[PDB]
Amino acid sequence: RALSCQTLAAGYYHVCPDGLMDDGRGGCVVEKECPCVHNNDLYSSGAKIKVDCNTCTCKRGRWVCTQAVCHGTCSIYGSGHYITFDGKYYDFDGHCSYVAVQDYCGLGSFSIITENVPCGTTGVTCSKAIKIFMGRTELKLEDKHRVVIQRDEGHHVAYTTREVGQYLVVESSTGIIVIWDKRTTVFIKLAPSYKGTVCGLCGNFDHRSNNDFTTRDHMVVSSELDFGNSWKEAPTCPDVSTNPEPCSLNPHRRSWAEKQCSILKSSVFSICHSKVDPKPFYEACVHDSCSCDTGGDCECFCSAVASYAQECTKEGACVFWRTPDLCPIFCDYYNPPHECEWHYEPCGNRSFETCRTINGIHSNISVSYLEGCYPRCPKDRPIYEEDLKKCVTADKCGCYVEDTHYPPGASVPTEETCKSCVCTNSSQVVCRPEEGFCYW
Amino acid sequence: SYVAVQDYCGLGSFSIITENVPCGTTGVTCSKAIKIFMGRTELKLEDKHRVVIQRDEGHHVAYTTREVGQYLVVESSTGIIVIWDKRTTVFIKLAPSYKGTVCGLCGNFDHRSNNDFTTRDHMVVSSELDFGNSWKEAPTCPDVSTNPEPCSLNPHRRSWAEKQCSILKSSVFSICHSKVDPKPFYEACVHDSCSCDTGGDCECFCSAVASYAQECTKEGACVFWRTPDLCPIFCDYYNPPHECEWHYEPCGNRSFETCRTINGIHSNISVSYLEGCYPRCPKD
Amino acid sequence: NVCSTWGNFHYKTFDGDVFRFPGLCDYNFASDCRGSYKEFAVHLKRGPGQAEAPAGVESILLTIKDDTIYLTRHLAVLNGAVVSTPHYSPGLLIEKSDAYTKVYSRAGLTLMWNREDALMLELDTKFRNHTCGLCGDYNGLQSYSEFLSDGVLFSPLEFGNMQKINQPDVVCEDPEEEVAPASCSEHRAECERLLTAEAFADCQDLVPLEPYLRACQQDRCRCPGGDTCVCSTVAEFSRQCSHAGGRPGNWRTATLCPKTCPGNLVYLESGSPC
Amino acid sequence: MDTCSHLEVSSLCEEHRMDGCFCPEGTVYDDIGDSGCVPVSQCHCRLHGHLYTPGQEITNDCEQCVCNAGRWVCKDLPCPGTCALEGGSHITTFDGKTYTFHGDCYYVLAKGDHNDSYALLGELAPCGSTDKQTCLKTVVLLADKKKNVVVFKSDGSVLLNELQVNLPHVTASFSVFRPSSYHIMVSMAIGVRLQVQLAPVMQLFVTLDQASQGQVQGLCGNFNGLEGDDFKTASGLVEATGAGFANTWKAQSSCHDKLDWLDDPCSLNIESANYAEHWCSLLKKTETPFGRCHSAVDPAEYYKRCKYDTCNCQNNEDCLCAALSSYARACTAKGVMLWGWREHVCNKDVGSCPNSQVFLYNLTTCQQTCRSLSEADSHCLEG
Ligand SMILES: *[C@@H]1O[C@H](CO)[C@@H](O[C@@H]2O[C@H](CO)[C@@H](O)[C@H](O)[C@H]2NC(C)=O)[C@H](O)[C@H]1NC(C)=O
Ligand SMILES: *[C@@H]1O[C@H](CO)[C@@H](O[C@@H]2O[C@H](CO)[C@@H](O)[C@H](O)[C@H]2NC(C)=O)[C@H](O)[C@H]1NC(C)=O
Ligand SMILES: *[C@@H]1O[C@H](CO)[C@@H](O)[C@H](O)[C@H]1NC(C)=O
Ligand SMILES: [Ca+2]
Ligand SMILES: [Ca+2]
Ligand SMILES: [Ca+2]
Ligand SMILES: [Ca+2]
């Protein structure tokens, strides 16, 4: 009879004396002061940690956590790698427009589509554009820019587009969020009010992952290529039959790919090995490097490594892996002639003041873990205006009306009648009537 | 291994050899290391470093190695200079005292370009492959028979190569168009981009464009062509935690005080046109 | 230092310890048992048994941290491709002279092999206390742990047997313990007279003598008739002489294992290959 | 246009209108079939080919569906779950989630949570030279309110309460059978069923009914339908790696903790890579007998594990045959049965059967001797 604080629930079926039990940290301890373990880390009694929306506590060698429902996340990345809302990795290489997510599941309020095209000569395909239908408005993410289309006359469901780090973030007041890295990666986040009322390549988000392969006609299949083929949009698009194997069709490119992608398994990421399993990212890195055989193959690799570095940051391991010879980043390009304010933030853990949050506007998600270059505005004009990427005084930032920036003083355009508008010299947008009939 | 330069020409004092190896699958080859024989000392430039070998007992002809911008510079007191970009590019600079007293792949430096195809046995030939094949070092090395055409053996890579390399002819380099003819550099860019088909082909292109930008700087046209999406450079990596003293100098036209020149030591050429990151040391 | 193998299955570790292991299947000639990352590994492959006197080598596999070199009697293969020697990669040099094949690596590895029987390997001092192949460890101890690990004095045959490599297609039987033959001390005078001749003057202080003559002892009696098995040791003695820094004379006569080359080319010792 | 499969197209119509041939106000265009603008309540369903009429039913794996107007209406059917411990270290939970462990201790494979119901253990221990070559050595079952301990060793020699026993052995609570001298099959009245394979390498298969969904804990997961909480330790939060979660289920406090192994054995043993590939690649050859199963079960995972095992262990042929005999069990569970797949690869013992015995592929339990027919209903466990 020798308990150890880790065989507590085992049963002791098959040193410390009677009573006290080994804790794994040192001398014997009573059951009450028995510590807790998590991801190869040993926490004493009465500690605190957070898991993605909640907070926990090591009570009696056991964790007690709050119960709130975190958001739901779907991931699209690489040459056709998908992660659904309930955590089911898979692959699919199509050439058509596919329903990423939607609410018209057998009347609906939105839809998010994607556009996959071939990239390479081995047959693999990758995403290169996004379309967002909200009510009647249609946003399109394309050519590193956001384009509005068919803006509805007077409903104009409130959204917000901005740029954080290297990523472009589009949020909707209803509870939809899209994060786009401008090349191939996409994250879709949904609020917990949509639970079990969506369908598409990202599953139906019901905390149950044995039914995410539901086809368009409400049938559960067991094949990736049948689930994928049933969500194409144009009926004339062809059907996928087999998944190509890049590194087998391009033998001469293997040696390089297996040598560069090996950094994930090196000692550089030694801190993150106990928190994120690197194998499903190493496989994606090798798969992507063997396929980009028509040019610009140093860009397929850096994004693949960044996808894993971002998760390491998200779980609490800020790692600095870029070097002047490995995926360099050119930040100070944005600085004024020779005043140094923009800095490469390896893991984005910085909360500064913009002219949006200065007026009480706040988001609903923490995006404090995105890589990129960030400002460090000086002390003579410390408010970061986003639509121009400029450090300005608290007075002269902008107005931000109808998702359009307007410089202070500038006559604010208005799609109303008899209503002129101006951005005051106090960052305040104010409108007046004109009796030229109509009145106030 | 081919003789880049030497003055054991038909008894000489030095020799500079190069080592070409295949880089690609089309048959083309590129330089990957350099060997410098001076008297008895032997330097070797390899794997991004300089390694000394067979350093002689007490002669030790004065030489100096240092790093300027992105390049590595070796200078010999006798009048030889080698500039190496650490990947494939090499510049050999010779004093005027070595006029008409050299032979090898770089000609005989005589201000006359109709005799530079002089083989190892003092014959003037008309074929590139005959002049080249005669300067190999090991007799067992094979003989080159033809010059491959990369963009013809890799048709699917042409469209990309002809699109990226077109920046040379674009308006970005409009100032330099009347000072350097870009056609021989456009052809080099296209030829290189079609061949780097085994990995890391974004490194063959930036060097090709930098070669032309360097000449534009050299003739008096300082052009800023790097962008966060086109061949980015990461200089502030060298800075202390958050003090900003290293800056990317687009065309190197800056002379500051090192602890060599502070004691009167000076070079014999101007290397004030080499790209890279430079310090801006503080006033304390 | 130098590990070497030559003659009628004669071996020599980094700390002397000359023995005889007539294995024939496949063995781990040398390796880097640092535990964390294996820098290199040299695997030897004997023949099926050429004849009583000679003991050749079929091929050699040599992996250095990313790439494998496969050296055969006639050709050398690098990463599955035939290379026209010499080769000048920026981390590896292969050259093929008529009398030797040489491989130089930047990790501190030098390999020299004549295509018939003689092989020698040189490592820097970095790999001390890490080598674990048939050449024993490289701690500098004379038969300290190679043969007496846990008090048991390992016989050469069993020590060699442990260093086998299992190829998962062929089963090869280890040699059986031979009956202890008489100590061939009746030919000691011949070996001593031959080895300590005039041509080997300026190496009597560079290389010892006892091990190499003890090797000649068995060689002389185990190899009756033709003297194809005794003059393969003094050749190793001369190679050690030349490698240390000395210079031997000429000893091969028309009646003492002579050699022939075309033209008026003269067989010599200690002359520049250039 | 609405086309009987892609309904509600008009809500996302980013175009203006022109002339052409169209459909009436209703009667969405027929896409699955080939008729004209038929009404909505005639849409024919499809399912991997065959064109099902509106009213024809079908029964899928764990559910039954009926073709309503264009869309299937499906209803769940009970179907049990299976945990598998295969190879030296390859654990497949009740919800997929494959992972590799390489442990050294006794571990709690699976035990009923209530207080007593049962417990199933297993000895994972080093097997060859290095620590990275492990094996399953013994299976221990604790049943009857943990008042009966049964032991299966990897040489036969099943024994109950530290005493050798004779087969068959049927009791009131459970029963054990040995139909072919290389397979021991145990049935428990609670709803647990066990298969133990004794050659070429010891393996274990556990099957549970569907009335115990969420009442099991161990290395085989919780069996609740979600494969993300499978690594949920017994003390709250979820782990990230495969070794971190496993260490918390040690049955002996004295054992040490292991860590994952970030290497591929096919890169350390070069001489074995060609051998491993040349044979394990047979799984993707359509002309080979395994080519038949390609329709039902994808072979990619089995191919990767075949290479892993063949490269890693030192009895390469034994591991090859053990890995190749797992595909021919998963496939033989979904109808397709691979007949005569032992003609080139693992025929080492096919011809060694005794005097009148021959190697069979459909040797079920109740093909037994005369006494089995004497009762004929005492020991014919099903499932
Ligand atoms: C964050 O979520 C809240 C919760 O809905 C959003 O608040 C809504 O805002 C819209 C218009 O601004 C109102 O019509 C809703 O009534 C609000 N919701 C509630 C519950 O009051 C908020 O807009 C979201 N954040 C952003 C930046 O849009
Ligand atoms: C630049 O060239 C001059 C010209 O030779 C070099 O000066 C020589 O220096 C060596 C030793 O330093 C003397 O032995 C020579 O006599 C000097 N030459 C003359 C003409 O006096 C000078 O060294 C060169 N620059 C560098 C950095 O070495
Ligand atoms: C270990 O120390 C050095 C190398 O680390 C070596 O020279 C020495 O002989 C070794 N000694 C022992 C006892 O292993
Ligand atoms: Ca689901
Ligand atoms: Ca000339
Ligand atoms: Ca020793
Ligand atoms: Ca589960």
* Residue owning the nearest CA to atom 8 of ligand 2: B77
DSSP structure string for D182-239: SEEEEEETTTEEEEEE-SSS-EEEEEE-TT-TT-EESTT---SS-SSSTTB-TTSSBP
Is A151 in a helix, a strand, or coil? coil
Q: Which residue has the tokens 């769940």?
A: D76
Integer angstrom CA distances of residue C164 from A173, C27, D316:
70, 5, 16
Ligand 2 atom with the smallest distance to the CA of B265 is 27
* B117 class by beta-carbon count within 10 Å (0-12 exposed, 13-18 middle, 19+ buried): middle
C-alpha–C-alpha distance, residues B253 and B276, integer Å:
11
Token pair recorded at residue B229: 């999406």
For residue C64, the Cα-to-chain-centroid distance in whole angstroms is 20
* A-to-D residue pairs, Cβ atoms closer than 8 angstroms: 131
Closest CA to A283 of C80, D262, D261, D229: D262
Determine how many CB atoms are found less than 10 A away from the CB of residue D254: 12
Distance, in Å, from the CA atom of B222 to the CA atom of B172, rounded to the nearest integer, reads 12
Structure tokens at A112: 């998010």
Residue pair A163/A169 in contact (Cβ under 8 Å)? The answer is yes
Closest among C244, C235, C245, C180 to C212, alpha carbons compared = C235
Q: How far is residue B222's CA from residue B273's CA, in Å, rounded to a whole number?
A: 9
Cβ contacts (< 8 Å) between A328 and chain B: which residues? 232-234, 237
Which residues are bridge partners to B71 per DSSP?
B68
Is B226 in contact with A328 (Cβ distance < 8 A)? no
Nearest to A349 by CA among A377, A305, A316: A316
Task: Give the Cβ contact number of residue C136 at 10 Å.
Answer: 25
Closest CA to A282 of A267, A298, A299, A260: A260
Q: How are strands ordered across the β-sheet holding C16-20?
A: C16-20, C10-13, C2-6, C119-123, C109-113, C101-105, C92-96, C87-89
Q: Which amino acid is at D13?
A: C
Which residues touch A336 (CB under 8 Å, ≥6 apart)?
none
Under the phi-then-psi rule, with left for phi > 0, alpha for psi from -120 to 50, and beta for the rest, what region is A429?
A: beta
CB C71 within 8 A of CB C101: yes
Would the CB atoms of C89 and B21 count as touching at under 8 Å? Answer: yes
Closest-CA residue, ligand 3 atom 12, reads C139
C-beta of residue A311 within 8 angstroms of C-beta of residue A371: no
Between β-strands C76-78 and B29-38, what pairing exists: parallel, antiparallel or unpaired?
unpaired
Q: How far apart are CA B246 and CA A382, in angstroms?
A: 25
- Contact between D237 and A12 using a beta-carbon 8 Å cutoff: no
HSE at residue C68, side-chain half, CA atoms within 13 A, is 14
Q: What is the resolution of this structure in A?
A: 3.8
Identify whether the C-beta of residue D84 lies closer than 8 Å to the C-beta of residue D91: yes
Paired tokens of C263: 């033209």
Q: What distance in Å separates the CA atoms of residue D43 and residue C267, rounded to the nearest whole number?
A: 95
Q: What angle do CA A75, A80, A85 make, to 5 degrees?
A: 25
User: What spatial distance separates the first Cα and last Cα of chain D, rounded to whole Å?
Assistant: 50
Residue D45, H or E segment = strand D45-46
C168/D275 touch (CB, cutoff 8 Å), yes or no: yes
| Ligand with smallest separation from the Cα of A365 | 1
Q: What DSSP state is assigned to residue B2?
A: E
- Give Cα A357 distance to the centre of its chain: 21
Write the CA distances from B121 to B13, B101, B145, C149, D263, integer angstroms: 20, 15, 20, 64, 56
CA distances from B93 to A343, B67, B72, D114 (A): 40, 17, 14, 86
> What angle (nearest 5°) sits at the alpha carbon of residue B156, between those of residues B154 and B157?
70
Which residues place a Cβ less than 5 A from the ion ligand 5? B 107-108, 110, 112, 115-116
Q: Say if ligand 3 is within 6 A of residue C63 CB.
A: no
Query: Taking chain B, what is the end-to-end CA distance rounded to the nearest angstrom?
Result: 50
Residue with tokens 């969506």: A198
Bond prior to A118 in cis (omega within 30° of 0) = no
Q: Please give the backbone phi and psi of residue D150, each rounded to the nearest 5 degrees, phi first.
A: -115, 145
**How many C-beta neighbours within 10 Å does residue C225 have?**
8
Q: Which residues contact B194 (CB under 8 A, 6 or more apart)?
A: B26, B150, B151, B153, B154, B157, B158, B161
CA distances from C129 to A6, A318, C28, C140, C261 (A): 39, 37, 17, 8, 44
Bridge partner residues of C102 (DSSP):
C95, C112
In angstroms, the CA D272 to CA C168 distance is: 6
Which one-letter DSSP state was computed for residue A134? E
Spatial separation of the C-alpha atoms in residues C29 and C19, rounded to whole Å: 14
Q: How far apart are CA A77 and CA D313, in angstroms?
A: 36
Q: Please name the amino acid found at residue A84.
A: T
Which token pair is B274? 């080499």
Residue B109 in contact with residue B5, Cβ under 8 Å? no
Amino acid at B284: D
Answer left, alpha or beta for residue C108, where phi above 0 means left and psi between -120 and 50 means alpha: left
**In one letter, which amino acid is D39?**
P
Assess contact for D142 and D149: CB atoms under 8 A: yes
Number of H helices, E strands in chain C: 4, 14
Q: In this structure, is the dihedral angle defined by the CA atoms of residues C49, C55, C57 and C62, taken in order, positive or negative?
A: positive
Q: Which two tokens stand for residue B38?
A: 């001076």
Distance of alpha carbon C195 from alpha carbon C202, whole angstroms = 13
Atom 10 of ligand 3, residue of closest alpha carbon: C139
Is the bond preceding D168 in cis, omega lying within 30 degrees of 0? yes
Q: Is the CB of C130 under 6 A from ligand 3?
A: no
Q: Report d(CA C184, CA C186) in Å as an integer.
A: 6
Q: Which residues contact C122 (CB under 8 A, 6 or more apart)?
A: C1, C2, C109, C110, C111
Q: In chain A, what is the greatest distance between 2 CA atoms, to the nearest angstrom?
A: 96
DSSP C134-192: TT---S--TTSSSSBSSS-B--HHHHHHHTB---TT---PPPPPPP------TTHHHHH
Please indicate if any CB of chain D lies within 8 Å of the CB of A135: no
- Cβ separation of B1 and C90 shorter than 8 Å? no
Kindly report the nearest CA distance between residue C227 and chain D, in angstroms.
38
DSSP-assigned states of every residue in A257-324: HHHHGGGGGSSTTTGGGGTS--HHHHHHHHHHHTT--SS-THHHHHHHHHHHHHHHHHTT------BT
Structure tokens belonging to residue C108: 């501190």
The residue among B233, B242, B252 whose CA lies nearest residue A331 is B233
Among A171, A186, A232, A142, residue whose Cα is nearest residue A365: A171
Give the CA diameter of chain C: 58
Neighbouring residues of C128: CB distance < 8 A, sequence distance ≥ 6: C138, C139, C140
Task: With beta carbons under 8 A apart, name residues in chain A contacting B156.
Answer: 121, 293-294
Q: What is the DSSP string of C59-112?
A: EEEEEETTEEEEE-SS-EEETTEE--SSEEETTEEEEE-SS-EEEEETTTEEEE
Chain C residue with the nearest C-alpha to that of B33: C90
- Contact state of A273 with D235 under an 8 Å Cβ cutoff: no
Tokens of B42: 């032997």
Where do the H-state alpha helices sit in chain D?
242-247, 270-280, 300-312, 316-330, 370-375
Chain A neighbors of B203, CB-CB under 8 A: 298
Nearest chain A CA: its distance from B149 CA (Å): 17
Tell me how far apart the alpha carbons of residues C153 and C175 are, in angstroms, rounded to a whole number: 19
How far CA D9 is from CA of A324, D4, D15, in Å, comes to 50, 11, 12
Q: How many CB atoms lie within 10 A of CB C248?
A: 22
SS3 content of chain A, % helix, strand, coil (to 5): 15, 30, 55
Residue nearest to atom 11 of ligand 1 (CA): A173
Gaps in chain B with C–N over 2.5 Å, residue before each: 10
- Exposed, middle or buried by CB within 10 Å (0-12, 13-18, 19+), for B244? middle
Task: Let me know: does B262 contact B204? Beta carbons within 8 Å.
Answer: no
Helix (H, G, I), strand (E, B) or coil at A91: strand
Looking at chain C, how many residues does it have? 274
In the structure encoding, which two tokens stand for residue A172, read together?
Answer: 């909707």
Pocket test of ligand 3: the residue of C1, C129, C143 to mutate, having most ligand atoms within 8 Å of its CB, is: C129
Residue D44 carries which DSSP code? P
Reduced to 3 states (helix: H, G, I; strand: E, B; else coil), residue B213 is helix
Residue type, A155: H
3-state secondary structure of A21: strand
Backbone angles phi, psi at D279, to 5 degrees: -95, -50
Strand partners, C69: C62, C78
Method for structure elucidation: cryo-EM
Contacts of A403 (CB under 8 A, 6+ apart): A159, A160, A161
Cβ distance of C167 and D271 shorter than 8 Å: yes
Q: How many CA atoms lie within 13 A of D366 on its CB side?
A: 12
What is the C-alpha to C-alpha distance for residues D36 and D27, in angstroms, rounded to an integer?
A: 9
Q: Is A22 helix (H, G, I), strand (E, B) or coil?
A: coil
Closest Cα partner for C247 from C258, C239, C255? C239
Query: What is the token pair recorded at A418?
Result: 């008899």
- Overall residue count recorded for chain B in this entry: 284
- Packing angle of the helix pair D316-330, D270-280 (nearest 10 deg): 30
- Residues A223-235, buried b or exposed e (16+ Cβ, 10 A)? ebbbbbbbbbeee
Q: How far is the CA of A68 from the centre of ligand 7 (A)?
A: 20
- Judge whether A365 and A189 are in contact, CB under 8 Å: yes
Q: Compute the distance between CA of residue D312 and CA of residue D301 in angstroms, rounded to an integer.
A: 16
The single residue listed with the structure tokens 């044995």 is A210
User: Could you tell me which of A99, A278, A302, A279 has the C-alpha nearest to residue A184?
Assistant: A302
Q: What are the beta bridge partners of residue A132? A: A112, A139
DSSP D137-156: -EEEEEETTTTEEEEEEBTE
Q: Which ligand is nearest to the CA of A199?
A: 4
Atom of ligand 1 nearest to the CA of A172: 28
Mutant choice from C66, C67, C87, C88 vs B, greatest count of B C-beta within 10 A:
C88
Residues B219/B220/B226/B231 CA torsion (nearest 10 deg): 20
Place of tokens 């964790």: A63
Chains D and B touch (3+ CB pairs under 8 A): no
- Residue C156: is the preceding peptide bond cis (ω within 30°)? no
Question: Closest Cα to residue B228, out of A60, C233, A302, A177?
Answer: A302
Tokens 């026209």 belong to C84
Give how far the C-alpha of residue C141 lies from the chain's centroid of Cα atoms, to the nearest Å.
Answer: 20
Q: Return d(Cα B258, Cα C26) in angstroms, integer.
A: 60
Element (H, E) at B75: strand B71-76
User: Do A179 and A187 contact (CB within 8 A), yes or no?
Assistant: yes
In 3D space, the residue among C157, C148, C269, C258 whose CA is nearest the CA of residue C202 turns out to be C269
B227 contacts B235 by C-beta, under 8 angstroms: no
Any idea which residue has 């020409």 for tokens? B9
Q: How far is CA B30 from the centre of its chain?
A: 12
